[PDB]
Design a protein around this nucleic acid. Structure first.
Ligand code: MG
Ligand code: MG
Ligand code: MG
Ligand code: MG
Ligand code: MG
Ligand code: MG
Ligand code: MG
Ligand code: MG
Ligand code: MG
Ligand code: MG
Ligand code: MG
Ligand code: MG
Ligand code: MG
Ligand code: MG
Ligand code: MG
Ligand code: MG
Ligand code: MG
Ligand code: MG
Ligand code: MG
Ligand code: MG
Ligand code: MG
Ligand code: MG
Ligand code: MG
Ligand code: MG
Ligand code: MG
Ligand code: MG
Ligand code: MG
Ligand code: MG
Ligand code: MG
Ligand code: MG
Ligand code: MG
Ligand code: MG
Ligand code: MG
Ligand code: MG
Ligand code: MG
Ligand code: MG
Ligand code: MG
Ligand code: MG
Ligand code: MG
Ligand code: MG
Ligand code: MG
Ligand code: MG
Ligand code: MG
Ligand code: MG
Ligand code: MG
Ligand code: MG
Ligand code: MG
Lengths: 58, 232, 159, 211, 105
RNA sequence: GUCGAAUUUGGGUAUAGGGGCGAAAGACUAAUCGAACCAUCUAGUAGCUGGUUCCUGCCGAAGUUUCCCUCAGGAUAGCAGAAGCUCGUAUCAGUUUUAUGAGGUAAAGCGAAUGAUUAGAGGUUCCGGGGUCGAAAUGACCUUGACCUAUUCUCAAACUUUAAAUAUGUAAGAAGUCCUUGUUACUUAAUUGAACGUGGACAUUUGAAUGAAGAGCUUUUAGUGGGCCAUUUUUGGUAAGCAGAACUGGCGAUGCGGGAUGAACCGAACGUAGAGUUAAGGUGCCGGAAUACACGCUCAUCAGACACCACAAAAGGUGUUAG
RNA sequence: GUGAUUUCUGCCCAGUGCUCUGAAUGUCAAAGUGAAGAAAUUCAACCAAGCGCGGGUAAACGGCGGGAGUAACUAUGACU
RNA sequence: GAAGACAUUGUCAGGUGGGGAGUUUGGCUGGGGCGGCACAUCUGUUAAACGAUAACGCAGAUGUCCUAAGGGGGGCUCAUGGAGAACAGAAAUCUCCAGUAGAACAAAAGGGUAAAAGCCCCCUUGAUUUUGAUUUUCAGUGUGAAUACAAACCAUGAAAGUGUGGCCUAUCGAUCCUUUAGUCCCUCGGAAUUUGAGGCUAGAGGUGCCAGAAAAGUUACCACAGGGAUAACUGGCUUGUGGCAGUCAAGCGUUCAUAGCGACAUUGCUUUUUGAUUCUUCGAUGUCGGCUCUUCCUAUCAUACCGAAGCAGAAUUCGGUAA
RNA sequence: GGUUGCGGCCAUAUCUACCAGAAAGCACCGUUUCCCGUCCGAUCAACUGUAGUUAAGCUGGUAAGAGCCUGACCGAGUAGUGUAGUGGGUGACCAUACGCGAAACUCAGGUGCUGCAAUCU
């Protein structure tokens, strides 16, 4: 006995029962994947402006 | 062996009764009106080449008035894959039985049955299809692995059972003759027809990485560096 | 059997246009991309390095990284009951700025000027775009323009 | 060899012409398409009559062959064999397939069978150009070509001149001046654009204003 | 394929850590050596009544091994491995391609 | 059939289950034999068949994805329920518009490249060959094809200069815009840039429409993994109530009115009653409702009578009716 | 194994078996022998039957074809 | 009397051993078998102009080849056509004009490329070291292949730069075991030293049924669980083929298309043929023919009445009503 | 406005054939000792602006040109196509209703635009 092999019937109906939702934008994305040479500097950059505001607000 | 078979079938001419011929990847199909026409062909094939075969059948009508159930028959023939001039490692038990021949051999004749020759110590041994198929193996290297050599001198030693055999052939590679200095010196069956300055073809075993387990069960030092298949 | 290679079905897609083969023009290389910019993807066929997969042909994302000869675009791709968030590393031939965002940016300067001028003028603004409203009345003159009477024509073959 | 023409009637499958993939196809039944007096000038045969199809159908290569013989055979005997020029417009390129044959459908793709046309509503099959007086022989000649085809087709008297893309009076407007010249079978007209040097080489009657 | 007997690549070895001359030959198996914990466990499991107590491989498919290269930096004698694609023939040293030679004999 | 012996037969005695016995049939071995009977291991195992016990309320599926000696089964995502938790006009939407991308199907084209293809006309021969005049000619006088010149007949799922419709990506602001001059081991010839900042300026016309029984998040678990039908596009096949795909709507899981009858057609989707109104379909009688009104056509010694649907063709006819 | 009487029982020992008052240095376990090492261990020589080699056997299992050429034509149950 | 340190007996070791025991003897599949591989992959097309998409659909390819056919730089222009040059002709070498690629780029097919990615030279090993992120196939797991960076060490080039194998899309493989390089670093647990063994990080030896069992037949003496998810017979859909009917009429029929024979085309009906399919039945619908016996169809062999004839008569042939 | 160096978009910039170029600049052009490359100082290398030219290159103009580029009550609201009906038709296919809308063909015009620096009767 042979089967029925493939279809996509009812697959688009199933999909919309629960939305098809977007993945939520965030203020501040991850620096995973970003140029290492740039990050290396940006770490040291904020340490300075925090210490500048810490010494300012003392 | 198929190109040989296609030539051999024409000489004696067993074909005529076929309706048509079609082809496929690794051979070709023959179609016959009557069942008894196709059996003569297989009996003819049994005569001239090593084979294995079997028949199965398909039913169609089953007429309730007798003398015509109407069956349709299919015979599946397999030629033995070791060709005429291949380089072969035999299995250990098989090699001990057939004359105590060495495991490292060339083929000889490829007739009704397959026959082997040992290029160094001239010797011969036969292998029938029934004995092949029960424990099947494959060739180490084919006709497409041959390499061109140039013969310089032949020193004969002695024996001649039927081919003026055991010639210590001094040879050098065609890619090496011009540039580089290197010489290979090897005993060979090609004694009667070998002359200095002749181009000869052969297997050059020194640079080939095989992957046969039979070959892996060998003596990485009793094995000959160079074997020459034929003149030209 | 089946065949699902990395560039299957791309006979006419990565093709090079008619009378526009050969070297890419220098203004392609002299354009400066920054983190945040919107860019459309369109794979040049001549440059084999840094190429996108056939899916991202015609998609438009945001930049997130910039490096020696490439940019990081970030696209949204849909799969099932969901969107995943996908990170590309394309060379700069296969990319160009979205002119829909550049249209927007210029309107922001227009609207800020309207509000700045409205305070100096004196109250009211109404700075939203209204869609095409239904059209008003008019008196179409017949002065040197009398109506031309027409009727349906009869069938003729001409073959 | 032949199946009934009712089987391969309607345009179902895609255009499947001869190429490097199909390769082997049988020879076309129809071979020569122009008949009558085909070394004739344009001024000789003004009155043009068509045979127009009124159905989206396939006409096989042997439906045209039997139709082309009977139209010619009647027109040759009655009006004489040099009183017309018959032209079969339709060329049969579409190859038909036949499943001539382990099991039935366990492996089933057909062999090539024969060539056929792909005719459309309002398409011209036969075109005949003739003298003014010799109409009734052409109308009755194409009547018997109609029985050899399936479907519905109709005969139409053309308003054009011969095989030209021009009406009865419009050709006579331009032929009186030096604006038309004979090509060989068909015809060439004057062009306002192009080089003025080789517009004077040919068309010697134009550029004069006299006769 | 064909390769040279020598290679000039990155040695790593405290005193090196730069590009240096490596000698090239070919990787050769190494013998099985009993007293290995596999062979001690196997010889116990076979001895007795019960027959063949392990799988025995027959259905082989491939025809060519991959080529591994022992590189020995001539300064520090620090060995380093390196692997190639599958191939039927393989040698090393000379036998170089010439300008444009036709077929002979 | 055989009926004086390789005869028939009582009692005693021997041979026991992978064993016996067998003038050989896999025959016989207590109605049991291609491995007897009895008890126990034993409630042996079964991806396979059959059954599975009270009422009501709310929600409500799947035959599809990947991997498996997988294809009458599982694991995995999916669809479903339940429990909630953080918040409370929320930001979103099987939709439109504005602005801006992507595509090579339909059509078109071939007097555009690629590949097929019917006709003549003008030329060109030191050059694929024949004839005519020849001692030969890189000669003429006739010719049939090759290519050349403008023409002409016809085409392409795996050709193409052009190129739709429908379907498809992104943007239309506070997580924003402008000024002010800080932070750095990154970047620049250059405190120039880059990325995130302090301080100040800009508010409910805060920057298209329409909508919003709230927006978001977590945990956990059932059934299912044989499908089938219909309009349009479609490949295999002569075709099929056939085999295989594409988008949508359905039956499966669904009664009610209509198609006499019917899984899928048309109408319409159901708590319990009264009154009104309609849908699809109808209004001679069966049968609830006009043997209504109006202009015409047709007479048949097989009339004709309502989609899906339960069939009819080429070809004819001084039948009759309009042109 | 064949299956009363009568008359016969053809050619074939390559293959598979069976067998041998035949060859001998090809293969080859465990014990023992030597060498190397601190020892556990490793490496060598030696080596039974069988295997392989050579004869016999078909009232053992079995098997008993083709192809060219022979001064027209003809090619034999001939000859090559 | 014989025989005698041989035999016999005991333990280990090699040979022989269907006499006996245990077990196995893929999957997809228009039934199953044979074949094929659609079983791991690649190009074009099927494929309906985003992406995804089936059939034992169509046209084909893979299990390799390369120290350059890799890296950088330099120097050039190809296929072909035309005009010229002793031997030299359609094909040898030299010179000129035209030449958007009609050439070439290891192999299938599709893209790509002109002071190049093609052809010829100079220099080389970036086909290297350390490990992370991303794309495709997807469960966003593995495998393979690729993208862009980083921290080192190099090649080339005057330099900008370029280079982490092969211009691009294919060219390959877990856990266990063995072994090689590295650390020459951990452990052998009463304490030590040297042999030996084990561990940590990175490769290799392989499973093509390619997410990876170690495997021959037979049953016509047969068994069990199921299957109408599936064959062998009636029925249904289909009608290619068979049978039967028109239409047009080639040739015939001494003159003469149509009294009558009647080819090929073109339009149908039949279910008395055979194919195609698998809807019903596998907890069973008795599977050939003959004998016997009723009834129905007409597509009428005879029997009744007619019309035509190339019907003198006789003897025929063709057609109508009629079962 | 013309030239030169470096360019942007890359035929309205090309191609075939003809015609004109004051200024300056480009160019062709002369030499072989040196660095350098050749079979060949032809190409590339250096030297001289010296001995000579607008004859070529280059720039602009001309052509009912070839091509290429923009339009048009040009073809055409056609071909094609989204949605609808117990619409027609034995079928093949065809009308109608809410919408979107081509290509060839035709005609008409056009034949480089511009950035930085330098330099010119
Ligand atoms: Mg299934
Ligand atoms: Mg499948
Ligand atoms: Mg690459
Ligand atoms: Mg033991
Ligand atoms: Mg009994
Ligand atoms: Mg139980
Ligand atoms: Mg509900
Ligand atoms: Mg498995
Ligand atoms: Mg079941
Ligand atoms: Mg396509
Ligand atoms: Mg088309
Ligand atoms: Mg197409
Ligand atoms: Mg499953
Ligand atoms: Mg089915
Ligand atoms: Mg169900
Ligand atoms: Mg319902
Ligand atoms: Mg009904
Ligand atoms: Mg409806
Ligand atoms: Mg009533
Ligand atoms: Mg016997
Ligand atoms: Mg007997
Ligand atoms: Mg024998
Ligand atoms: Mg024997
Ligand atoms: Mg013997
Ligand atoms: Mg013997
Ligand atoms: Mg045994
Ligand atoms: Mg045994
Ligand atoms: Mg057994
Ligand atoms: Mg199976
Ligand atoms: Mg099979
Ligand atoms: Mg697509
Ligand atoms: Mg290369
Ligand atoms: Mg201890
Ligand atoms: Mg491995
Ligand atoms: Mg392995
Ligand atoms: Mg068995
Ligand atoms: Mg049987
Ligand atoms: Mg029996
Ligand atoms: Mg029995
Ligand atoms: Mg069934
Ligand atoms: Mg029953
Ligand atoms: Mg019954
Ligand atoms: Mg009747
Ligand atoms: Mg000079
Ligand atoms: Mg110079
Ligand atoms: Mg001049
Ligand atoms: Mg022009």
């Amino acid at each position: 006995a042979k089967s029925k092999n493939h279809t996509a019937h009812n697959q688009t109906r199933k999909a919309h029962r629960n939305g098809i939702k977007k993945p939520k934008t965030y203020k501040y994305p991850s620096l995973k994947g970003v140029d290492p040479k740039f990050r290396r500097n940006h770490k040291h950059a904020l340490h300075g402006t925090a210490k500048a505001l810490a010494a300012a607000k003392k | 062996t198929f190109l040989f078979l296609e030539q051999l079938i024409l000489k004696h001419n067993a074909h005529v009764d076929t309706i048509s011929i079609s082809e496929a990847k690794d051979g070709l199909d023959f179609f016959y009106a009557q069942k008894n026409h196709a059996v003569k062909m297989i009996d003819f094939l049994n005569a001239v080449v090593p084979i294995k075969h079997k028949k199965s059948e398909e039913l169609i009508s089953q007429d309730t008035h007798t003398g015509a159930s109407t069956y349709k028959f299919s015979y599946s023939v397999e030629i033995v894959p070791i060709c005429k001039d291949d380089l072969v490692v035999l299995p250990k038990k098989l090699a001990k039985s057939m004359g105590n021949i060495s495991q490292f051999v060339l083929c000889s004749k490829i007739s009704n049955t397959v026959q082997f020759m040992d290029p160094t110590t001239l010797q011969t041994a036969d292998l029938s299809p029934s004995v092949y198929w029960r424990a099947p193996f494959n060739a180490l290297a084919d006709v497409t692995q041959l390499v061109e050599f140039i013969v310089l001198d032949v020193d004969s030693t002695g024996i001649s059972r039927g081919n003026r055999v055991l010639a210590d052939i001094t040879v050098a590679r065609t890619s090496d003759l011009g540039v580089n200095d290197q010489v290979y010196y090897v005993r060979s069956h090609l004694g009667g027809i070998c002359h200095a300055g002749d181009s000869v073809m052969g297997y050059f075993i020194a640079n080939s990485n095989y992957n046969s387990d039979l070959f892996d069960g060998l003596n990485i030092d009793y094995v000959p560096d160079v074997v020459l298949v034929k003149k030209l | 059997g089946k065949s699902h290679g990395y560039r299957s079905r791309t006979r006419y897609m990565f093709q090079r246009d008619f009378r526009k083969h050969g070297a890419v023009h220098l203004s392609t290389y002299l354009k400066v991309y920054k983190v945040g910019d919107i860019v459309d993807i369109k794979a040049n066929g001549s440059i084999q390095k840094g190429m996108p997969h056939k899916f991202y042909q015609g998609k438009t994302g945001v930049v997130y990284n910039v490096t020696k000869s490439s940019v990081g675009v970030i696209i949204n791709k849909m799969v099932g009951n969901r969107y995943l968030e996908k990170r590309l590393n394309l060379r700069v031939e296969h990319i160009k700025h979205s002119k829909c965002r550049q249209e927007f940016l210029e309107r922001v300067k227009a609207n800020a000027a309207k509000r700045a001028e409205a305070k100096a003028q004196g109250v009211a603004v109404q700075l939203k775009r209204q869609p095409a409203q239904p059209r008003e009345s008019r008196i179409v003159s017949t002065e040197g323009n009398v109506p031309q009477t027409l009727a349906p024509v009869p069938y003729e073959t001409f073959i | 060899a032949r199946r009934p023409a009712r089987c391969y009637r309607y345009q179902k499958n895609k255009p499947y012409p001869k190429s490097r993939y199909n390769r082997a196809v049988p020879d076309s039944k129809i071979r020569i398409y122009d008949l009558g007096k085909k070394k004739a000038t344009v001024d000789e045969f003004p009155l043009c009559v068509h045979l127009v199809s009124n159905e989206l159908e396939q006409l096989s290569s042997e439906a045209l062959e039997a139709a082309r013989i009977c139209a010619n055979k009647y027109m040759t005997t009655v009006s004489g064999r040099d009183a017309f020029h018959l032209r079969v417009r339709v060329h049969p390129f579409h190859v038909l397939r036949i499943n001539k044959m382990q099991q039935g459908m366990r492996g089933a793709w057909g062999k090539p069978h024969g060539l056929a046309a792909r005719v459309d509503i309002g398409q011209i099959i036969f075109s005949v150009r003739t003298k003014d007086s010799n109409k009734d022989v052409v109308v009755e000649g194409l009547r018997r070509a109609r029985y050899k085809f399936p479907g519905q087709q109709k005969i139409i008297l053309s308003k054009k001149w011969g095989f030209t893309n021009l009406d009865r009076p419009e050709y006579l407007k331009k032929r009186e001046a030096g604006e038309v010249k004979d090509d060989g079978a068909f015809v060439k007209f004057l062009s306002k654009k192009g080089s003025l040097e080789n517009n004077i080489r040919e068309f010697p009657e134009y550029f004069a204003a006299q006769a | 394929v064909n390769v040279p007997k020598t290679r000039k690549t990155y040695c790593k070895g405290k005193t090196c850590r730069k590009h240096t001359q490596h000698k090239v030959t070919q990787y050769k198996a190494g013998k099985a050596s009993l007293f290995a914990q596999g062979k001690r466990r196997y010889d116990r499991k076979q001895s007795g009544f019960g027959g063949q107590t392990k799988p025995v491989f027959h259905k082989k498919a491939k025809t060519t091994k991959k080529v591994v290269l022992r590189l020995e930096c001539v300064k520090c004698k620090t060995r380093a491995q390196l692997t190639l694609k599958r191939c039927k023939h393989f040698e090393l040293g000379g036998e170089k391609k010439q300008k444009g030679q036709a077929l002979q004999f």
